[PDB]
Amino acid sequence: EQIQETENGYKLELEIPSAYYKYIIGKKGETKKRLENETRTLIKIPGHGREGSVVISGHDRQGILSAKTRLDLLIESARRRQPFTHFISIPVNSQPIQDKFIEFKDDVVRFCSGDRGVDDTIFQNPHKLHLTIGTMPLLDKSEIDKAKAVLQQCKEELIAYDYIGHGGITCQLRGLEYMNDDPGEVDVLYAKIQLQDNSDRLQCLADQLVNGFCESGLMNREHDRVKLHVTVMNTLMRKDPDRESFDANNILKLYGDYDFGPYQINTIHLSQRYSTSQDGYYACEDKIDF
């Protein structure tokens, strides 16, 4: 995208997802009028249904560049507020893992039923056990395509850095953790991912994926580094009748070192939020395999 001369001034044509038009315009046009005044530009947004480019026009390059910078920041801010549509995931859901998870769930339900808030409806679906690297709102085809291209580029970079290679990385899913302060009032329990010798290779892989997607603008950096853990219980899933939390004290004292076994990481997905595939995992927008 480069500014072009018009007969009497300059213009810049931009491809912006229409989901952001309402933020550029603002309430009764207040936001767009303000940007136009600050920069001495006009900002033309395609009418509804009418599809095309946002056009910044003005008499000088500097004002157009200033308007572009301000639109970029406005879109970035709006993106942080959009519901996520996709997420980068690493499945951790081989049959041995799932069998160990089912045994863990059955033990917790059998032996910790009497503990406040524990029931059989607050467990992850074993087919969906996964590590989440990060979420993204991908609000049109262009954004989905960009995310797929970033994922494929990340494959090459991860291999070049030796963060993964042929056949993938072996990990172990073992031990429970909670992130909140009080083990008697837990809403989410996770199982920890470890590597042999506590190697940091997977941490590096995860953080490099985040770097790639954040550099693209599609992902917002929320956490300092990826937490290498898998959700196993979450009370937001409860189906039976912090009133939502459970007392995890006995779960942790009885099963806190539970070993779900090893798992071979050989695929990383751009997963869709809402649909599922025939294997019972999240539907796969794209993947990289090792």
Domain boundaries, the chain: 4-80, 86-289
Considering Cα of 246, then 110, then 259, then 204, what sign does the dihedral take? negative
Residue 78 and residue 106 in contact, taking contact as beta carbons nearer than 8 Å: no
CA distance 179 to 177: 7
Beta bridge partners of 135: 87
Burial profile 210-249: b = 16 or more Cβ within 10 angstroms, e = fewer: bebbbeeebbbeeeeebbbbbbbbbbeeeeeeeeebbbbb
For domain 4-80, the CATH architecture is 2-Layer Sandwich (3.30)
Technique used to solve these coordinates: X-ray
| β-pair type (169-177, 259-265) | antiparallel
Express the helix, strand and coil content of the chain in percent, nearest 5 each.
40, 25, 35
Token pair, residue 10, equals 């300059």
CA distance 208 to 211: 5
CA distance 176 to 143: 36
Amino acid identity at 102: I
Token pair, residue 145, equals 């395509």
Token pair, residue 174, equals 């073992």
CA distance 228 to 194: 8
Q: What is the resolution of this structure in A?
A: 1.1
The superfamily CATH assigns to domain 86-289 is: Cyclic phosphodiesterase (3.90.1140.10)
Q: Tell me the DSSP string of 114-167.
A: TSTT--TTSB--GGG-EEEEEEE---SHHHHHHHHHHHHHHHHHHHHTTSS-TT
168 burial type by CB count under 10 A (0-12 exposed, 13-18 middle, 19+ buried):
middle
Which of these, 213, 268, 277, lies nearest to 91 by C-alpha position? 268
Instruction: Give SS3 for 18.
Output: helix
- CATH topology match: 4-80 vs 86-289: no
Name the region of 283 (left: φ>0; alpha: ψ -120 to 50; beta: rest).
beta
